[PDB]
Amino acid sequence: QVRLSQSGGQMKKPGESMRLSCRASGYEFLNCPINWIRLAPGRRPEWMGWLKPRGGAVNYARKFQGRVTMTRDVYSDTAFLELRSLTSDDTAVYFCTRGKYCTARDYYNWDFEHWGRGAPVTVSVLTQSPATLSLSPGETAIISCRTSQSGSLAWYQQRPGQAPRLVIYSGSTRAAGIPDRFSGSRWGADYNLSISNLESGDFGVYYCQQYEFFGQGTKVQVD
Amino acid sequence: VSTVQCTHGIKPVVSTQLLLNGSLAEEEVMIRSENITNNAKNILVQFNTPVQ
Amino acid sequence: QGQLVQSGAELKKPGASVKISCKTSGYRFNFYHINWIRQTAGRGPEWMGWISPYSGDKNLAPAFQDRVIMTTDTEVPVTSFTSTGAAYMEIRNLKFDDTGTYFCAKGLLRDGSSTWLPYLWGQGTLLTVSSASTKGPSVFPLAPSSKSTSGGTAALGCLVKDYFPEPVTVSWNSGALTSGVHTFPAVLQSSGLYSLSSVVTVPSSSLGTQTYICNVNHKPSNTKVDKRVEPKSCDKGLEVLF
Amino acid sequence: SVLTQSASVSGSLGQSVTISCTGPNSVCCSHKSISWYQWPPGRAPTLIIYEDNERAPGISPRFSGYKSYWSAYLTISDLRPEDETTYYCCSYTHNSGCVFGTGTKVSVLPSVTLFPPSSEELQANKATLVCLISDFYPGAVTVAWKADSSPVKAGVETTTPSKQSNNKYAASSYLSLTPEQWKSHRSYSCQVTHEGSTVEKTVAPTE
Amino acid sequence: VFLGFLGAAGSTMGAASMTLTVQARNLLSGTVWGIKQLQARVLAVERYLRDQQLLGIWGCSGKLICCTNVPWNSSWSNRNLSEIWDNMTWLQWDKEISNYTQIIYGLLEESQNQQEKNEQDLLALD
Amino acid sequence: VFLGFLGAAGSTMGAASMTLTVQARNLLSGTVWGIKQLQARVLAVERYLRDQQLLGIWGCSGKLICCTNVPWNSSWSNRNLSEIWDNMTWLQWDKEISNYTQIIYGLLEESQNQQEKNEQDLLALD
Amino acid sequence: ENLWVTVYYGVPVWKDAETTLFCASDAKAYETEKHNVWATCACVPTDPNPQEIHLENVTEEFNMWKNNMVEQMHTDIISLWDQSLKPCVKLTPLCVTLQCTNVTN
Amino acid sequence: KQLRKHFGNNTIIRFANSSGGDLEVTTHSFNCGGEFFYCNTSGLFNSTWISNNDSITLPCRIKQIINMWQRIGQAMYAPPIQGVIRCVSNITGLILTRDGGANNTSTETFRPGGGDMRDNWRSELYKYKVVKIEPLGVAPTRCKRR
Numbered sequence A: 001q002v003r004l005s006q007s008g009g010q011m012k013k014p015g016e017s018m019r020l021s022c023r024a025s026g027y028e029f030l031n032c033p034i035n036w037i038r039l040a041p042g043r044r045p046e047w048m049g050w051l052k053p054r055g056g057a058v059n060y061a062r063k064f065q066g067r068v069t070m071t072r073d074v075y076s077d078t079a080f081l082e083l084r085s086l087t088s089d090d091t092a093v094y095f096c097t098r099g100k101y102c103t104a105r106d107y108y109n110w111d112f113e114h115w116g117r118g119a120p121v122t123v124s125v126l127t128q129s130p131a132t133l134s135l136s137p138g139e140t141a142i143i144s145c146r147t148s149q150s151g152s153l154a155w156y157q158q159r160p161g162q163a164p165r166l167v168i169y170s171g172s173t174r175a176a177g178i179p180d181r182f183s184g185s186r187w188g189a190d191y192n193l194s195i196s197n198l199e200s201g202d203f204g205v206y207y208c209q210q211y212e213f214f215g216q217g218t219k220v221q222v223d
Numbered sequence B: 001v002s003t004v005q006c007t008h009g010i011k012p013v014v015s016t017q018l019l020l021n022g023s024l025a026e027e028e029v030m031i032r033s034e035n036i037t038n039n040a041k042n043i044l045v046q047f048n049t050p051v052q
Numbered sequence C: 001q002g003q004l005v006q007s008g009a010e011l012k013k014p015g016a017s018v019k020i021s022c023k024t025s026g027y028r029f030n031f032y033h034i035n036w037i038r039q040t041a042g043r044g045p046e047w048m049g050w051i052s053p054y055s056g057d058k059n060l061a062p063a064f065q066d067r068v069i070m071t072t073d074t075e076v077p078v079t080s081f082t083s084t085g086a087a088y089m090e091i092r093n094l095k096f097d098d099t100g101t102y103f104c105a106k107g108l109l110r111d112g113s114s115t116w117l118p119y120l121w122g123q124g125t126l127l128t129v130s131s132a133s134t135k136g137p138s139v140f141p142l143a144p145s146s147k148s149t150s151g152g153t154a155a156l157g158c159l160v161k162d163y164f165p166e167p168v169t170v171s172w173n174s175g176a177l178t179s180g181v182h183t184f185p186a187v188l189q190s191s192g193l194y195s196l197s198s199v200v201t202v203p204s205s206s207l208g209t210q211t212y213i214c215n216v217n218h219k220p221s222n223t224k225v226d227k228r229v230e231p232k233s234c235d236k237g238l239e240v241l242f
Numbered sequence D: 001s002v003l004t005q006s007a008s009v010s011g012s013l014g015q016s017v018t019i020s021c022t023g024p025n026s027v028c029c030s031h032k033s034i035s036w037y038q039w040p041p042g043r044a045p046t047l048i049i050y051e052d053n054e055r056a057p058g059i060s061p062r063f064s065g066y067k068s069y070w071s072a073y074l075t076i077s078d079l080r081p082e083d084e085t086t087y088y089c090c091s092y093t094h095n096s097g098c099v100f101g102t103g104t105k106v107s108v109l110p111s112v113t114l115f116p117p118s119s120e121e122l123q124a125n126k127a128t129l130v131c132l133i134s135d136f137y138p139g140a141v142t143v144a145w146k147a148d149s150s151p152v153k154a155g156v157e158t159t160t161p162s163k164q165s166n167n168k169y170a171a172s173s174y175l176s177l178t179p180e181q182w183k184s185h186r187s188y189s190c191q192v193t194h195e196g197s198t199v200e201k202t203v204a205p206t207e
Numbered sequence E, F: 001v002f003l004g005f006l007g008a009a010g011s012t013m014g015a016a017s018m019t020l021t022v023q024a025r026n027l028l029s030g031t032v033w034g035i036k037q038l039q040a041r042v043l044a045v046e047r048y049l050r051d052q053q054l055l056g057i058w059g060c061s062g063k064l065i066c067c068t069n070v071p072w073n074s075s076w077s078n079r080n081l082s083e084i085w086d087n088m089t090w091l092q093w094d095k096e097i098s099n100y101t102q103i104i105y106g107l108l109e110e111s112q113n114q115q116e117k118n119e120q121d122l123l124a125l126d
Numbered sequence G: 001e002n003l004w005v006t007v008y009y010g011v012p013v014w015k016d017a018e019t020t021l022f023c024a025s026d027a028k029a030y031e032t033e034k035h036n037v038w039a040t041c042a043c044v045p046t047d048p049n050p051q052e053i054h055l056e057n058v059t060e061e062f063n064m065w066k067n068n069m070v071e072q073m074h075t076d077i078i079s080l081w082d083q084s085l086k087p088c089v090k091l092t093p094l095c096v097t098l099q100c101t102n103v104t105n
Numbered sequence H: 001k002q003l004r005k006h007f008g009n010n011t012i013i014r015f016a017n018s019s020g021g022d023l024e025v026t027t028h029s030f031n032c033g034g035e036f037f038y039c040n041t042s043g044l045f046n047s048t049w050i051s052n053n054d055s056i057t058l059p060c061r062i063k064q065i066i067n068m069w070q071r072i073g074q075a076m077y078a079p080p081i082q083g084v085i086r087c088v089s090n091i092t093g094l095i096l097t098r099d100g101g102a103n104n105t106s107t108e109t110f111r112p113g114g115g116d117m118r119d120n121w122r123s124e125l126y127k128y129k130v131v132k133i134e135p136l137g138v139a140p141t142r143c144k145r146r
């Protein structure tokens, strides 16, 4: 089974640098890139970059160019990241992710089916609606996300204190272990995720995703 | 569309970044990408006039 | 099994020329001829000519042999068996007897004895050749009236009065309200101006739950009017229900 | 036109009707092909018969064609209410184009609402009474106007009966009046006569 | 005119029926890395004998063209004679009939030459 | 009744002559260790074309059954018509005729279609 | 009037698939010899007069990113590199300690 | 001018060299005369284009022990080549990568990439595809026997 094992979180001071590791297992490390995404509470998730272990190729987000350094150890299948000149804005939980489709022939990076446990680091478009949704067990939740670019859209679920789990990809295709209660629909630029017969496990926060961009999130809580 | 039994002479030039000894494009230089909005997919550029 | 969409209706003075387009989609544009057939109120149905987009051979009627030019663009492939294309035609030396509806039609077969035969037709483009100049319409709101007291239904609408030339398109709420809409043909007054009326039958209980905006479009004068039909009626047979 | 069809032909429901399409030898019919088209006035025509006796794709087998040496014919078995329209024929070949005929009008054997002139029209100032007629058959009605129970012969105009989409007919009549006559008469009426029965709607400016 | 192998690919079925003897001719054509072509020309001749076996068990044997005693079911895309041979390509036709190819094949190998040849065995003894 | 492949093996030759279209149908059937089946199905198709060649050069071509203008030699186990088709299996018959199979084959490929077809070439020119 | 099925053999009908491609590399390149340069050893000589038949009226969809010829060529060059390095001298006793120094400059 | 047809008409396109990684990705890796060069492509991708006489020399390193195609298990020692090696080639195309997480700003930055050698084959096999012939086609017509 595909497993991403991350190093723990840490508390840094402003001006310092941080380094994180993520050991992949259960698949051929060279087949597809590993991504690094930061999630700050009540903030749009930020994709930092990807690395192809084959050749060590890298691609950094504009915001981080000159500050971030991504490398890998092919022998230990471990991906490393470093972030310099830390400021209060960098406080967030940092994840390493791997896409769902990853064979020898080709891949698709942005359907993040595999996530590390995350590392909490404290240093001291896509229009998603509604912001919040208070519903009772049994009802149906309809979350909406408006795009402007189109392309394989995904829905993720984050449970309080757990790593996000891929729920839907391609706008209408369920992932492994996802029951029929979850369903996706599309009309023009609009995307709807419908969760029927709500239950305790379903509550959390949900995100829409289009390539490296994420929505502001929708907190679904029990009422 | 035309049909052929054998393709033209393709030299297996193993190189990176700069495509060497390739086929020139027609008219304007060509830009090919599987997903332009995707910044993770490489962008193959084909020239019309070769750079010596 | 495709679709032929033509350009909008234009108004041209006698002596000038006019170019009517005909975009096709949903089939191979090069596999069928493009016939052009007009219809006036004085000469009946008349076949003008056809043109084959693949080669470019044309065959015009002797009546339109010296004043009609047919042109076709290249085929834009969509699938392996369907495509999108566009055919044009330019008729010069317009006269008063050229006023009528002009259609473009797709051929029936590729081979045989009836290859060019007009099979699939368009919606038609009305062409008016007149000196009498363009006059804008005058939209007046038609007050809702009582249609059935026991039923609690009414009928409100708009009045397009004094316009030239034809036609005038009237929609409701940008094409949202279509059920129960009855548009009556216009009347030819003694002055030569047309005037039609549109009326939609709606229940009386709908007042502050639906906005009634009649959209009158008159492209020859390049003018659009969006009138807010007041839901408050004046018919005594309907006020009892309110 | 040189291709002559039948002026008018009729037929009862559930029966047949034959439409003629003849002309000189230069257009019909030796070594010539004949086609037929269902062309509703104001709508797009539909190909029915091509190559004398062959039916167009998707055409019900109720239609049939037959060509002799001097004229061609079209038999429509089992008549439908939506078959009462104009049907044209075409004399053509493989090289030359189409030479349509004169046409054949095939005959297969009311809600009135009067609107008074709006307030915006009274500030122009004009006055036009609108008598709308809908959902009536057959298309043959007469419209008479009255100014306070007295015949009106000025400014009376009525449109031709047009077939709707629900296989029924509609029309509209208009009365052009002056702002003085609108405020000098107690009421105005719009009598519509159909098959002897005369319906009448009356509006009153006094109320 | 000789458009060549796969020449009349975009032409109608009636027009492409004239080029049958062209695509049939070039269908057979007469340490590792040398077995790469061996296993390929073996699958090539297995594909050829597969089609020849289907062509033999049916009421054809004689290649190119052959007729059969099977009524065309209207559910198999009810088109007209002049709408198939003069208004449709073979690729476009096979795209529609792909659902019923195996059904027709079953109505050709079983219902025909198994009942027809036995009938001839009954007709040839007298 | 359909006994299946090799069904009427113990039945008389006359009874087993009804199951000819069953053993003929399943006769063709459509890194090392993978070449084990390749060389076998290649010998399978070589054995098939071998029998088809013998069936073609003789006065048959049309498979299953065909008649010939060859007198039955009494030395080839002189049996009667009713003693063969109603009292002998195909295995028992082939066990006796195994000596003369090659002789008859020679009298079938050479004496017939080489002298008969040339005779037809002489009969078809006039 | 009732139609009857007829089998046609040799119709221009193709479907997208993947098969085993073989090589071709002219006839002058084989004269380059030098103990089999690169790959050309048992490769079939290229046809002197190749034929390219323009399929009129034909519109076919291509996909360079889902094309199997790329994967086949890649694996072919990899196997080529291995077969080209199998009979060569192996430098197993070359990982000895190297007492290195600067170049004479 | 062709890049502005896909990322907006009035935009700034900036060129920067590789972000980092292995030597085969950050440098122009190629073979010439048997030797394996790795050239510095920082003088070619150092520009900034707004909406509207000599040679550029690049420092090239030479490696003899290579592990191309990211292969582990087989390391090849390129034997030395006698004589001055000179080679003239054609630059006929590029393999570029675009930087992500933009949102803000109208400029776009492109850097040299590579790694996957399949892209080198995709630059020549884009106009070819393999199809299989199915010559058996049934079709209705007014033909039978007795």
Ligand SMILES: *[C@@H]1O[C@H](CO)[C@@H](O[C@@H]2O[C@H](CO)[C@@H](O[C@@H]3O[C@H](CO[C@H]4O[C@H](CO[C@H]5O[C@H](CO)[C@@H](O)[C@H](O)[C@@H]5O)[C@@H](O)[C@H](O[C@H]5O[C@H](CO)[C@@H](O)[C@H](O)[C@@H]5O)[C@@H]4O)[C@@H](O)[C@H](O[C@H]4O[C@H](CO)[C@@H](O)[C@H](O)[C@@H]4O)[C@@H]3O)[C@H](O)[C@H]2NC(C)=O)[C@H](O)[C@H]1NC(C)=O
Pocket (backbone or CB within 6 Å): A150, A187, A188, A189, B032, B033, B034, B035, C025, C077, C078, C079, C084
């Ligand atoms: C190589 O160059 C070629 C050009 O030669 C090129 O091909 C064109 O590529 C361009 C992109 O640059 C295309 O233009 C885009 O088309 C996208 C796809 O359109 C399909 O999908 C539409 C949506 O379908 C879903 O939704 C409907 C309704 O809900 C649903 O019913 C279906 O089930 C489906 O689920 C679809 O409607 C559309 O169909 C219309 O369009 C075709 C013509 O394209 C037309 O013939 C049909 O009759 C029908 O009217 C089409 O099938 C597309 O998403 C996009 O539109 C979005 O973006 C624009 C803004 O950019 C938005 O305004 C718009 O609102 C949408 O959000 C745009 O139209 C074009 O389709 C390609 N041409 C062909 C033939 O494929 C390549 O892209 C180039 N390649 C590279 C690598 O550069």
Ligand SMILES: *[C@@H]1O[C@H](CO)[C@@H](O[C@@H]2O[C@H](CO)[C@@H](O[C@@H]3O[C@H](CO[C@H]4O[C@H](CO)[C@@H](O)[C@H](O)[C@@H]4O)[C@@H](O)[C@H](O[C@H]4O[C@H](CO)[C@@H](O)[C@H](O)[C@@H]4O[C@H]4O[C@H](CO)[C@@H](O)[C@H](O)[C@@H]4O)[C@@H]3O)[C@H](O)[C@H]2NC(C)=O)[C@H](O)[C@H]1NC(C)=O
Pocket (backbone or CB within 6 Å): B013, B014, B015, B020, B021, G034, H030, H031, H032, H033, H034, H082, H083, H086, H087, H088, H089, H090
């Ligand atoms: C893109 O495509 C271009 C076009 O081909 C290509 O350029 C080629 O570059 C290579 C170098 O990498 C060239 O191949 C070498 O060329 C040199 C110099 O050529 C001179 O000699 C010939 C002799 O007639 C003259 O005609 C010519 O004009 C020049 O004056 C040769 O010396 C090389 O020969 C040796 O090397 C080969 C490979 O190592 C051997 O196979 C060959 O047998 C030779 O080996 C013998 O001679 C050596 C001489 O010292 C000796 O030391 C050895 O031990 C051995 O005994 C070689 O042919 C080529 O010339 C260029 N092409 C052209 C048209 O000139 C690019 O390389 C290509 N890009 C990529 C990335 O591949």
Ligand SMILES: *[C@@H]1O[C@H](CO)[C@@H](O[C@@H]2O[C@H](CO)[C@@H](O[C@@H]3O[C@H](CO[C@H]4O[C@H](CO)[C@@H](O)[C@H](O)[C@@H]4O)[C@@H](O)[C@H](O[C@H]4O[C@H](CO)[C@@H](O)[C@H](O)[C@@H]4O)[C@@H]3O)[C@H](O)[C@H]2NC(C)=O)[C@H](O)[C@H]1NC(C)=O
Pocket (backbone or CB within 6 Å): C030, C031, C032, C052, C053, C054, C055, C056, C057, C110, C111, C112, C113, C114, C115, D094, D095, E010, E011, E015, G056, G057
């Ligand atoms: C590619 O796809 C196209 C369709 O887009 C094909 O072209 C059509 O082919 C059909 C026939 O299969 C055409 O129909 C014929 O038009 C001819 C036009 O004649 C003039 O032009 C030719 C060429 O310049 C001249 O030599 C001749 O002198 C004329 O000046 C007619 O003569 C035809 O009528 C005759 O043939 C029909 C049978 O088709 C008979 O029934 C008639 O009685 C008469 O004898 C016919 O109308 C059509 O013209 C073609 N298209 C174009 C644009 O010309 C291609 O066939 C297809 N590709 C391939 C490879 O087939």
Ligand SMILES: *[C@@H]1O[C@H](CO)[C@@H](O[C@@H]2O[C@H](CO)[C@@H](O[C@@H]3O[C@H](CO[C@H]4O[C@H](CO)[C@@H](O)[C@H](O)[C@@H]4O)[C@@H](O)[C@H](O[C@H]4O[C@H](CO)[C@@H](O)[C@H](O)[C@@H]4O)[C@@H]3O)[C@H](O)[C@H]2NC(C)=O)[C@H](O)[C@H]1NC(C)=O
Pocket (backbone or CB within 6 Å): G102, G103, G104
């Ligand atoms: C790479 O590194 C290696 C060493 O690991 C080098 O190989 C050695 O190179 C040095 C040169 O710096 C060689 O030293 C020379 O040896 C010559 C051999 O002469 C022999 O015979 C004479 C009698 O005729 C004896 O006296 C002598 O001891 C030898 O047994 C000498 O003749 C040379 O002397 C000349 O040059 C010196 C330079 O200062 C002068 O002072 C002298 O007067 C005289 O002109 C010299 O001593 C050594 O032999 C090489 N060893 C091997 C094993 O090959 C490479 O040179 C080096 N390469 C680079 C690029 O750095």
Ligand SMILES: *[C@@H]1O[C@H](CO)[C@@H](O[C@@H]2O[C@H](CO)[C@@H](O[C@@H]3O[C@H](CO[C@H]4O[C@H](CO)[C@@H](O)[C@H](O)[C@@H]4O)[C@@H](O)[C@H](O)[C@@H]3O)[C@H](O)[C@H]2NC(C)=O)[C@H](O)[C@H]1NC(C)=O
Pocket (backbone or CB within 6 Å): A073, A074, A075
């Ligand atoms: C065998 O050959 C291998 C080549 O495939 C060599 O592997 C590489 O060795 C270099 C060093 O020369 C490494 O680069 C360094 O990595 C360190 C990592 O520091 C962190 O890890 C160490 C060890 O756990 C720890 O002590 C530190 O505190 C850090 O936590 C960097 O700090 C350096 O700056 C430098 O980048 C490569 O990472 C390594 N790569 C691989 C794939 O192994 C190997 O060294 C050779 N064996 C020997 C004995 O030299």
Ligand SMILES: *[C@@H]1O[C@H](CO)[C@@H](O)[C@H](O)[C@H]1NC(C)=O
Pocket (backbone or CB within 6 Å): A149, A150, A151, A152, B034, B035, B036, B037
């Ligand atoms: C990316 O490519 C896929 C495959 O053709 C396509 O479905 C998708 O729409 C593309 N995305 C964009 C944004 O064009």
Ligand SMILES: *[C@@H]1O[C@H](CO)[C@@H](O)[C@H](O)[C@H]1NC(C)=O
Pocket (backbone or CB within 6 Å): E073, E074, E075, E076
């Ligand atoms: C013909 O098709 C129809 C509709 O699918 C079906 O009811 C019938 O069984 C079919 N008959 C044959 C002989 O295939």
Ligand SMILES: *[C@@H]1O[C@H](CO)[C@@H](O)[C@H](O)[C@H]1NC(C)=O
Pocket (backbone or CB within 6 Å): D058, D061, E078, E079, E080, E081, G001
């Ligand atoms: C033509 O199509 C119609 C409608 O499906 C059908 O009634 C008729 O049998 C077809 N005729 C031929 C000759 O295919």
Ligand SMILES: *[C@@H]1O[C@H](CO)[C@@H](O)[C@H](O)[C@H]1NC(C)=O
Pocket (backbone or CB within 6 Å): E095, E096, E097, E098, E099
């Ligand atoms: C093929 O059969 C399926 C399932 O019945 C259906 O969805 C599809 O429309 C059919 N297509 C054709 C071309 O008959």
Ligand SMILES: *[C@@H]1O[C@H](CO)[C@@H](O)[C@H](O)[C@H]1NC(C)=O
Pocket (backbone or CB within 6 Å): F073, F074, F075, F076, F103, F107
């Ligand atoms: C028939 O058998 C006898 C004796 O075995 C032999 O002499 C004769 O040659 C045989 N006939 C033929 C045609 O071989």
Ligand SMILES: *[C@@H]1O[C@H](CO)[C@@H](O)[C@H](O)[C@H]1NC(C)=O
Pocket (backbone or CB within 6 Å): F078, F079, F080, F081
């Ligand atoms: C029957 O068998 C006998 C004895 O071998 C033989 O004399 C006779 O010719 C045979 N008759 C037939 C018809 O086979």
Ligand SMILES: *[C@@H]1O[C@H](CO)[C@@H](O)[C@H](O)[C@H]1NC(C)=O
Pocket (backbone or CB within 6 Å): F095, F096, F097, F099
């Ligand atoms: C087969 O031939 C041999 C040699 O003449 C002989 O001994 C044997 O009896 C023959 N068997 C049969 C069944 O004819």
Ligand SMILES: *[C@@H]1O[C@H](CO)[C@@H](O)[C@H](O)[C@H]1NC(C)=O
Pocket (backbone or CB within 6 Å): H017, H018, H019, H020, H026, H027, H041, H042
């Ligand atoms: C890019 O060029 C800069 C010079 O400004 C150099 O410092 C850097 O190492 C280069 N990076 C790569 C990956 O070539």
Ligand SMILES: *[C@@H]1O[C@H](CO)[C@@H](O)[C@H](O)[C@H]1NC(C)=O
Pocket (backbone or CB within 6 Å): H040, H041, H042
């Ligand atoms: C490439 O060249 C730039 C500019 O001289 C330099 O800063 C950089 O360090 C060089 N890269 C390497 C790997 O030497």
Ligand SMILES: *[C@@H]1O[C@H](CO)[C@@H](O)[C@H](O)[C@H]1NC(C)=O
Pocket (backbone or CB within 6 Å): H042, H046, H047
């Ligand atoms: C890139 O170009 C600019 C402008 O000429 C120059 O200032 C800078 O030093 C260059 N970078 C390198 C690494 O040469």
Ligand SMILES: *[C@@H]1O[C@H](CO)[C@@H](O)[C@H](O)[C@H]1NC(C)=O
Pocket (backbone or CB within 6 Å): B021, B050, B052, H089, H090
């Ligand atoms: C490379 O470019 C040069 C310069 O024009 C040209 O002479 C040569 O033929 C080209 N090589 C090719 C196209 O293989």
